[PDB]
Ligand binder design. Sequence first.
Ligand SMILES: COc1ccc(Oc2c(Cl)cc(NC(=O)Cc3cccnc3)cc2Cl)cc1C(C)C
Length: 253
Amino acid sequence: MASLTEIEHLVQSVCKSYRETCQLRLEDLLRQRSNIFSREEVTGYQRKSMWEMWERCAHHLTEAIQYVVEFAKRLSGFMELCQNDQIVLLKAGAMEVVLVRMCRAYNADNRTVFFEGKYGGMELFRALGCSELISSIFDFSHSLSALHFSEDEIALYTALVLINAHRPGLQEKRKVEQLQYNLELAFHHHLCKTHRQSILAKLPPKGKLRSLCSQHVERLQIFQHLHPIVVQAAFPPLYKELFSKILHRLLQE
Ligand SMILES: COc1ccc(Oc2c(Cl)cc(NC(=O)Cc3cccnc3)cc2Cl)cc1C(C)C
């Protein structure tokens, strides 16, 4: 199964699907690198209530997840899997894909991230009350930024983050294994062709992405225990379904 010409066709198909479903083009994020939050704007964010900052972040993550769902729908073989398997994969990998895509909005020179039109450091998120999680996200983004990923590398890498045949709950495991294997060949083929196989040993262990998503679910539970009505009344329905049935509807479009 799958010859060399079919693997190269898969490479281009994945890259195209990724370009079409980017929340912001890479150049839009680079051109904004000198637009940094002033000391006064940072204090403004710090002084916001914990629940207002949590609602803002849950709204931005929901928007980013919506682009990830669209990327999955454009991925060759994804819409062919059963609906149970599509939902199992999006439920475990959607936040993981948002976290890898986050490195494009991260500036390693000054340790800032793009958020609401400008760049700011970790201290912008102090009001969330989950400094360890933000810190882990910034470290993960910094570690990814040290690899100097091209857009095509991110497309192939995030396709593999999403198409994981080890997710518990998968009914047609072999069908996901075949698609994962084809995407692995496409990723390794593209790395070999462009003299970039050296990044393979430097890719983060799979347990690191799982650790960030687990910390996110735990910090959300702490916040939801303190503010149940805020989550119920002001958090996006899709965010609550993933982390706290919108997905079936999003998938049928
Ligand atoms: C996994 O959990 C979390 C993850 C992140 C987080 O705060 C953010 C958010 Cl919401 C957005 C951005 N940047 C962006 O969304 C910037 C962006 C915009 C458009 C295209 N690419 C990137 C940066 C950060 Cl650090 C908080 C939590 C939890 C604590 C709620």
